Amino acid sequence: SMSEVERALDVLLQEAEELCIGSSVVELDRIPTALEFCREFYSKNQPVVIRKALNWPAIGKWTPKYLIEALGDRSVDVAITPNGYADGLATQNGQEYFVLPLETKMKLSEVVRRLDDPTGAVHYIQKQNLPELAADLRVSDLDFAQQSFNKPPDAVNFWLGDERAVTSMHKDPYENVYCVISGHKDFVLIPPHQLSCVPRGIYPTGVYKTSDSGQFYIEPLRDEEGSDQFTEWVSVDPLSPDLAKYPEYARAKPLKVRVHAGDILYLPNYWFHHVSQSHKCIAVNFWYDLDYDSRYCYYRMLEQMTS
Amino acid sequence: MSEVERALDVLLQEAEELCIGSSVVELDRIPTALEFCREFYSKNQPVVIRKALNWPAIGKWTPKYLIEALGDRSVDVAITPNGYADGLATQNGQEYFVLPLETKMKLSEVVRRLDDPTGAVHYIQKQNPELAADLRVSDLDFAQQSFNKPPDAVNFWLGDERAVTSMHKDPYENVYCVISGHKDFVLIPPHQLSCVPRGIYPTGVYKTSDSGQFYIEPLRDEEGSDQFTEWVSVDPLSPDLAKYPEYARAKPLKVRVHAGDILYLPNYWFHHVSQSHKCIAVNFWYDLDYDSRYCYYRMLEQMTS
Numbered sequence: 001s002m003s004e005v006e007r008a009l010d011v012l013l014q015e016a017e018e019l020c021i022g023s024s025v026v027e028l029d030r031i032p033t034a035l036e037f038c039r040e041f042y043s044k045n046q047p048v049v050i051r052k053a054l055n056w057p058a059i060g061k062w063t064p065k066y067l068i069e070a071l072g073d074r075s076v077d078v079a080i081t082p083n084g085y086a087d088g089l090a091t092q093n094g095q096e097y098f099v100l101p102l103e104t105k106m107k108l109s110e111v112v113r114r115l116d117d118p119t120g121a122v123h124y125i126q127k128q129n130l131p132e133l134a135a136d137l138r139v140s141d142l143d144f145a146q147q148s149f150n151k152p153p154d155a156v157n158f159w160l161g162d163e164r165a166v167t168s169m170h171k172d173p174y175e176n177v178y179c180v181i182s183g184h185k186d187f188v189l190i191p192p193h194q195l196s197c198v199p200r201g202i203y204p205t206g207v208y209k210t211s212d213s214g215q216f217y218i219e220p221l222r223d224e225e226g227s228d229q230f231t232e233w234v235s236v237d238p239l240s241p242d243l244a245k246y247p248e249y250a251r252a253k254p255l256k257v258r259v260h261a262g263d264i265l266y267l268p269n270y271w272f273h274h275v276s277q278s279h280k281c282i283a284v285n286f287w288y289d290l291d292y293d294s295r296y297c298y299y300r301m302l303e304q305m306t307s
Numbered sequence: 308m309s310e311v312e313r314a315l316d317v318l319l320q321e322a323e324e325l326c327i328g329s330s331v332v333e334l335d336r337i338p339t340a341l342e343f344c345r346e347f348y349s350k351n352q353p354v355v356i357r358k359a360l361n362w363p364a365i366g367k368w369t370p371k372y373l374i375e376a377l378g379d380r381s382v383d384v385a386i387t388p389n390g391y392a393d394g395l396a397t398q399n400g401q402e403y404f405v406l407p408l409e410t411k412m413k414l415s416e417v418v419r420r421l422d423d424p425t426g427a428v429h430y431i432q433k434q435n436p437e438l439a440a441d442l443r444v445s446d447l448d449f450a451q452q453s454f455n456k457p458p459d460a461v462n463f464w465l466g467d468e469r470a471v472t473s474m475h476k477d478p479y480e481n482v483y484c485v486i487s488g489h490k491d492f493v494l495i496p497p498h499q500l501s502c503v504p505r506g507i508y509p510t511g512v513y514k515t516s517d518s519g520q521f522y523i524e525p526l527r528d529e530e531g532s533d534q535f536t537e538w539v540s541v542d543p544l545s546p547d548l549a550k551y552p553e554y555a556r557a558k559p560l561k562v563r564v565h566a567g568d569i570l571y572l573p574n575y576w577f578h579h580v581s582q583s584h585k586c587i588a589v590n591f592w593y594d595l596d597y598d599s600r601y602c603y604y605r606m607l608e609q610m611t612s
């Protein structure tokens with residue numbers, strides 16, 4: 001037989017499956033009205049991809065060379081890992097850590113040089129919040145979705161990175177409107193209600209550093225006069241899931257979607273996502289704080305049930 | 308405690324810290340379609356709009372004008388001895404969930420019975436002429452666009468003050484419009500299911516004898532098997548907290564809906580309903596569009612039983 005909690009989880013999954021809840025990424029060829037977006041996607045916590053939605057001048061123009069020419073060879077913040085897994089699991093001396101990227105400043109031209117050097121470490125630029133570049137985007141074009149959130153973005157992120165930079169599976173407390181400018185992004189998505197199918201562990205936290213001789217290593221993170229820090233993190237690799245180690249993952253129904261230059265992906269709050277991309281892909285995305293209702297509380301309960 | 312109980316405690320603590328479903332929002336002006344979808348539908352959040360509707364029917368519609376308009380047609384009416392149609396009642400030391408006595412009656416006789424304080428409790432309930440012109444259903448478009456489909460049911464209700472609707476839930480989005488008088492709702496949010504005691508009761512129906520006496524007649528299925536119904540056990544108006552201490556953690560909401568007011572009652576919200584004498588109301592039921600919230604609620608049902 002099954003335990004009470006197991007039967008309850010089985011009910012949740014069976015009901016979602018029969019009702020096709022979060023069982024696909026809706027695909028649209030035209031931008032919906034704000035009311036359509038609110039009814040069909042925001043209110044249903046349902047992801048959607050709109051093809052060739054944006055005609056921003058950035059799309060088809062922005063490249064690393066174009067950005068160097070447009071903004072000069074200025075110093076930007078860059079993230080570096082030896083393995084391509086910033087905010088990702090990696091082992092050292094027999095111990096598995098959740099590892100943060102090495103963050104540094106370097107000149108855009110040097111970033112371009114290291115992007116052209118796959119014998120070297122994996123790099124990507126990230127910028128969170130430009131008179132030469134604000135002209136190339138029209139944020140108001142996303143109003144059709146923003147009107148469901150009825151608030152300005154918490155954050156606007158710019159990403160430009162190596163094809164080897166993989167973002168391991170996580171979720172965010174934001175509504176995410178994701179716009180690819182150049183190249184393509186590959187998303188693996190898992191709906192929140194399938195949490196019981198996604199194994200999670202508790203891991204010592206580390207950060208990448210380079211030794212005096214240039215070798216990468218993992219430095220554990222410690223608080224002032226105190227012990228090691230820990231992070232809960234998804235432990236499955238959606239590209240190579242170990243179903244012997246994580247049989248429950250066999251019951252997940254991951255969704256795969258490719259977002260091209262000019263496409264918009266609405267990634268709803270608390271959806272698990274794992275992200276890859278083409279080489280020198282460029283993207284911008286908009287994070288809005290979520291509006292709490294009973295789904296968040298049910299998700300917290302689901303967390304308690306799967307601990 | 309058990310794992311299930313700790314899970315339910317986590318749920319309730321989170322919802323209480325966020326005050327999910329802690330009040331019925333009050334509007335003095337009909338919102339836009341987009342406002343309604345974003346603030347209320349997508350949040351499974353009730354809302355009452357004051358003096359929203361100016362239909363001719365508001366103010367005019369009373370039993371006398373109705374008799375005039377329909378030529379005293381014979382209507383289907385529900386009768387109970389206690390005023391609790393679809394409600395619990397004891398007979399022979401056993402507690403049944405009782406359906407109403409369903410009969411046919413001239414509107415004039417219904418009006419006469421409503422005026423009898425010593426008589427049984429009557430109410431007219433009619434579910435789908437010159438009356439259609441007294442309404443303007445398109446005025447509810449602001450809500451219908453969130454449902455994106457025509458009403459799956461439209462109900463008319465005219466009733467005695469003693470008719471009380473015991474606490475229950477519906478799998479419908481409900482747009483409730485009071486025509487004459489007022490309705491009093493007690494609401495409990497779905498996520499508080501574990502605070503609402505429910506029991507399994509044998510099904511029964513009210514019937515009158517040859518001498519005019521109400522009794523409870525058991526029901527059965529196709530065979531002679533006894534029929535059962537799950538039903539909320541607590542009386543919100545005077546809850547037995549000794550027998551049902553968990554209900555102390557529920558936080559019911561009281562709202563009075565006057566003539567011209569609109570109440571949006573979201574799907575699966577518990578509601579207990581009273582009304583003023585000869586109250587008239589019309590409501591619109593829309594089948595729900597299943598999302599993850601419904602599946603969470605089905606899980607919650609499995610856990611609390």
Ligand SMILES: O=C(O)C(=O)N[C@H](Cc1ccccc1)C(=O)O
Nearest residue numbers: 087157159167172176275276285
């Ligand atoms: O937009 C996101 O939430 C997200 O996970 N973006 C990732 C990169 C990223 C990683 C970490 C923080 C912000 C953004 C991507 O590969 O596009």
Ligand SMILES: O=C(O)C(=O)N[C@H](Cc1ccccc1)C(=O)O
Nearest residue numbers: 462464472477481580581588590
């Ligand atoms: O509209 C409802 O869902 C509802 O429970 N209405 C109650 C009575 C009722 C009971 C059953 C069917 C329709 C209406 C009222 O007093 O208006």
Ligand SMILES: [Mg+2]
Nearest residue numbers: 236237241242
């Ligand atoms: Mg794995």
Ligand SMILES: [Mg+2]
Nearest residue numbers: 541542546547
């Ligand atoms: Mg009681």
Ligand SMILES: [Mn+2]
Nearest residue numbers: 170171172273
């Ligand atoms: Mn993310």
Ligand SMILES: [Mn+2]
Nearest residue numbers: 475476477578
């Ligand atoms: Mn009801």
